[PDB]
Amino acid sequence: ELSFGARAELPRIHPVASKLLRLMQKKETNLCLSADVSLARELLQLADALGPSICMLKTHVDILNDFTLDVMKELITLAKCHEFLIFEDRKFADIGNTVKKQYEGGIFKIASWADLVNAHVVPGSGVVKGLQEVGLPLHRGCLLIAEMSSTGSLATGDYTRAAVRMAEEHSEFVVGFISGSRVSMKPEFLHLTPGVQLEAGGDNLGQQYNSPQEVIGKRGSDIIIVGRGIISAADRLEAAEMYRKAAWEAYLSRLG
Amino acid sequence: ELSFGARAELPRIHPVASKLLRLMQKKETNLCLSADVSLARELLQLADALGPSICMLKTHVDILNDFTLDVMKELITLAKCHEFLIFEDRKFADIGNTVKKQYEGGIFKIASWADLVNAHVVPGSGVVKGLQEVGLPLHRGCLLIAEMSSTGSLATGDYTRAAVRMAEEHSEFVVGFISGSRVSMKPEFLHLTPGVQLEAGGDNLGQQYNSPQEVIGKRGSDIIIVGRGIISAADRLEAAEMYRKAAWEAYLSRLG
Numbered sequence A, B: 001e002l003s004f005g006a007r008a009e010l011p012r013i014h015p016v017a018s019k020l021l022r023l024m025q026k027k028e029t030n031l032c033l034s035a036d037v038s039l040a041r042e043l044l045q046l047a048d049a050l051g052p053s054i055c056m057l058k059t060h061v062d063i064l065n066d067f068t069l070d071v072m073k074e075l076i077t078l079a080k081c082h083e084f085l086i087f088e089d090r091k092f093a094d095i096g097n098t099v100k101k102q103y104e105g106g107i108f109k110i111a112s113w114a115d116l117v118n119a120h121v122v123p124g125s126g127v128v129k130g131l132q133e134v135g136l137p138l139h140r141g142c143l144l145i146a147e148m149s150s151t152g153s154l155a156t157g158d159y160t161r162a163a164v165r166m167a168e169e170h171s172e173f174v175v176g177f178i179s180g181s182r183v184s185m186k187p188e189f190l191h192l193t194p195g196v197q198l199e200a201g202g203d204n205l206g207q208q209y210n211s212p213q214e215v216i217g218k219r220g221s222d223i224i225i226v227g228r229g230i231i232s233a234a235d236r237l238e239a240a241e242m243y244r245k246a247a248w249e250a251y252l253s254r255l256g
Ligand SMILES: NC(=S)c1cc(=O)[nH]c(=O)n1[C@@H]1O[C@H](COP(=O)(O)O)[C@@H](O)[C@H]1O
Pocket: A034, A036, A089, A091, A147, A148, A149, A150, A178, A194, A195, A196, A207, A225, A226, A227, A228, A229, B094, B095, B098
């Protein structure tokens, strides 16, 4: 097993994965903030204050009540200042012809500001081929949803294996996974894991939580994605630091 | 097998399904236009001209370059005038807590104007439970994606069976499926089938086409969803009429 800094230099590394792995190693963070907020001001205040603690900020542009492209300009300024990537959690999930238009166009112009997006693999590889027609010219990357954290997830067994094959066959654009565990044996791929809290439990709508130690240390993932464990806390900076230190130490201990 | 008009009266029918089945029978149309356009003016001009020919207009609000809620007000006026439902093809596809916010909120306020939305079943039943917390109070309906038209689709076998079970267990909100065929034996559920053209073929990004006769007549679906077969034609009204007559006669012949 290689450090994040060494993985950043692998021959087959994607440039977006390399940038991410280098800033993870530099900043000692493998935390992705899930900024599930409805106000641009709260999104930007979280990005500014927590930027030093995170490798990545995951957005849901479609729940911002006051989305504009200027908000995303201000977010990019903070991402460059504090050195983190922007990941729009769009879950592209249809035929290639449709997702190509959804990625480039409409009011959000996601490809113009998102370093990373994700896709469900259920439509077959056309979902990746369509996105890559927009994303490759713009030097973007994509994550494939290989496993899900929620009760009754169908992203298991042969579905997960199909996601891994699709990623490994589209390595010029696919840089990793949303997963609960290491699913690819190839170190060039990032594993990002949502469904993470320090305390045991879940929510009222099928979310299930595992700890940073469990998902980074035992399950071999690279990055934790944390929403409410941070966002609902009073001091979101302290909460982000607790999650960062948990995920980072779990990574160091596994690396040995 | 019951006519659309008789299915509209079934004891367990959802009110949105009943409204749809009644206007299908009244207008002799089982055609859903896939209005995959980037200009509000083109969306509204298609909705006005093709409204009499369609039971439903399927939107992708996120590819409209000039989306506003006023555009959706104008679309509702046309839907009421010409009697068709509005189906936003949002493909909700995450944990219940997230999709609840995506359905109600952000710039699109989808629940405020969409009679129908759809969801992928990959997250497990929490995707339906989250959407229904917004959709049930607003008397809306949902379609579950049980099969997909594209090459390499993973919506097969046990995945399709899980979608059918999830629909049948959430009948207060789920009114049917996106599928290639009849997948539920319960006549209260609608089957809507995309990947439809009069001519054989596909696209360059994994879309595959079957004819209205094949999917309504042989595969037992209720409604065809047609995009480019209409949208790319010079005379979109004539094209819509050809697809309407094809789907309607296939339905009549199967009913006997
Ligand atoms: N789309 C992805 S990254 C995803 C996949 C998954 O399996 N489980 C997921 O919780 N997520 C997302 O991660 C976030 C988890 O938030 P929280 O439960 O920590 O508050 C949320 O935005 C959800 O949409």
